[PDB]
């Protein structure tokens, strides 16, 4: 009774077994706004459909 779960997100404790890679997680780390917004665009290739 001297150790509880965390009081912020109430997520249960983990045994920290790395049997799965670090990408496979249920609480991933966020991403930067500049990375999410400023993205590489796509060029018009030419073999598209004719627009109306």
């Amino acid at each position: 009774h001297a150790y509880n779960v965390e009081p912020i997100s109430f997520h249960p404790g983990s045994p920290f077994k790395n049997t799965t890679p670090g990408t496979w997680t249920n609480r991933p780390t966020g991403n930067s706004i500049m990375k999410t917004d400023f993205l590489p665009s796509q060029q018009p290739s030419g073999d598209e459909r004719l627009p109306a």
């Binding site: 930067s32 706004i33 500049m34 990375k35 917004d37 400023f38 993205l39 590489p40 665009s41 796509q42 060029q43 018009p44 290739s45 030419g46």
Partner: protein, 437 residues
């Protein structure tokens, strides 16, 4: 052969540069790695990138700009971004300490170790060109790096390259919205030390862009990218007459001879107003009269310093797209007939028209839509005296109790400089009063 050297001081300047260089690459067809696609093309001619880029011979379009910030974070996230390969690694200059919203740290202790290397890179970029048009400096009045280091580099550039024109795209503090606490102190100090070394200083207000994005683009949650893309549209509209071709034109030198009446009054406003989304872009005619009327509406100003409280001195009216030289004349005539828009009595001829046939460039994922015409106004109004008066009142309230003065006094900055900045601001105050009466 024309060339514009961009210096991006501070986090605000670097993020605005990250928007504007993205816009430049999109509008010139340059890919983020640096090469042209070489399988498709967009068409600008063989020389409509030389104002901002250079050819290495191999086909690498390395751009200009002297991206600088004392803290490492924003410079390294730019280095680890989409445009990693575009920029020269020596262009992106950074330090270790942060000025931490301190003009004293930006101007006296932390900046001076990096001023020399920034000046050397600026000298290399100036030697790389043939005919230099001007120095486009992107910063915020803000605090620390954008306030102190920008002023120190401005002093060094005035010593070295005296006759070259300088533009000072700057984020001016909002009337009610504020982020920093010592922002009035930094604003007054950077104004005092940019007054004798500026050539023309453009003001942009975050709160006014917030309300414009809410009213026009219909977004209630805008971030800094949605503001910096509008600022990118501003700078592109200003310097597109150098790059593209058209009707009656303008380079950077007329922006001080047709917009600065006296060598104190060099703070025009910025007003782009075909600010419309794709939901309502094709359901209305974006005619020249409509867009110029919407540009002289005070709700579309990006300073929130309402021009009905003062009188206009000069208006540099830049048009971009399918703009007729008689339609612009009719719009200016029918607005000069209006009595709500007031001009000073000593400037009957209060306009400077400049037209390009290039349509505005949209950004994929951006908020704006594709429009036939665009208007950017540089209005030098006497209404900005109320914004100076408000920052003067804030400076008086802080400096009366000597709050937040111990940092500046203990790290550089003999105490009389605060009173120097205050007195020069009051001189500017009733200078505006005397040129208004």
């Amino acid at each position: 052969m024309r060339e514009c050297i961009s210096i991006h001081v501070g986090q605000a300047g670097v993020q605005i540069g990250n928007a504007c260089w993205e816009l430049y690459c999109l509008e010139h067809g340059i890919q983020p790695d640096g090469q042209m696609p070489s399988d498709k093309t967009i068409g600008g001619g063989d020389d409509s990138f030389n104002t901002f880029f250079s050819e290495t011979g191999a086909g690498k379009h390395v751009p200009r700009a002297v991206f600088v910030d004392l803290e490492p974070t924003v410079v390294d996230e730019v280095r680890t971004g989409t445009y990693r390969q575009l920029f020269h690694p020596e262009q992106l200059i950074t330090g270790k300490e942060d000025a931490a919203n301190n003009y004293a740290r930006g101007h006296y202790t932390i900046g001076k170790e990096i001023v020399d290397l920034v000046l050397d890179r600026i000298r290399k970029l100036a030697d790389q060109c043939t005919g230099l048009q001007g120095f486009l400096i992107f910063h915020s009045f803000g605090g620390g790096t954008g306030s102190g280091f920008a002023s120190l580099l401005m002093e060094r550039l005035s010593v070295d390259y005296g006759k070259k024109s300088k533009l000072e795209f700057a984020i001016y503090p909002a009337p009610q919205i504020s982020t920093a606490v010592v922002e009035p102190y930094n604003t007054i100090l950077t104004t005092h030390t940019t007054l004798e070394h500026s050539d023309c200083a453009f003001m942009v207000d975050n709160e006014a862009i917030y309300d414009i994005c809410r009213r026009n683009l219909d977004i209630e949650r805008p971030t800094y990218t949605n503001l910096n893309r509008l600022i990118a549209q501003i700078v592109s509209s200003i310097t597109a007459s150098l790059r593209f071709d058209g009707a009656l034109n303008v380079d950077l030198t007329e922006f001080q001879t047709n917009l600065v009446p006296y060598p104190r009054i060099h703070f025009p406003l910025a007003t782009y107003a075909p600010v419309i989304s794709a939901e309502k872009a094709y359901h209305e005619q974006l005619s020249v009269a409509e867009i110029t009327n919407a540009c002289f509406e005070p709700a579309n100003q990006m300073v929130k310093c309402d021009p009905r409280h003062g009188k206009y001195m000069a208006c540099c009216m830049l048009y971009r797209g399918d703009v007729v030289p008689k339609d612009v004349n009719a719009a200016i005539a029918t607005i000069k007939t209006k009595r709500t828009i007031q001009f000073v009595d000593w400037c009957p001829t209060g306009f400077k028209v400049g037209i390009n046939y290039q349509p505005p460039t949209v950004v994929p994922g951006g908020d704006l839509a594709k429009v036939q015409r665009a208007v950017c106004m540089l209005s030098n109004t006497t209404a900005i005296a109320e914004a100076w008066a408000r920052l003067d009142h804030k400076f008086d309230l802080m400096y009366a109790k000597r709050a937040f003065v111990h940092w500046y006094v203990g790290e550089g900055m003999e105490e009389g400089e605060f009173s120097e900045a205050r007195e020069d601001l009051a001189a500017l105050e009733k200078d505006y009063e005397e040129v208004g009466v």
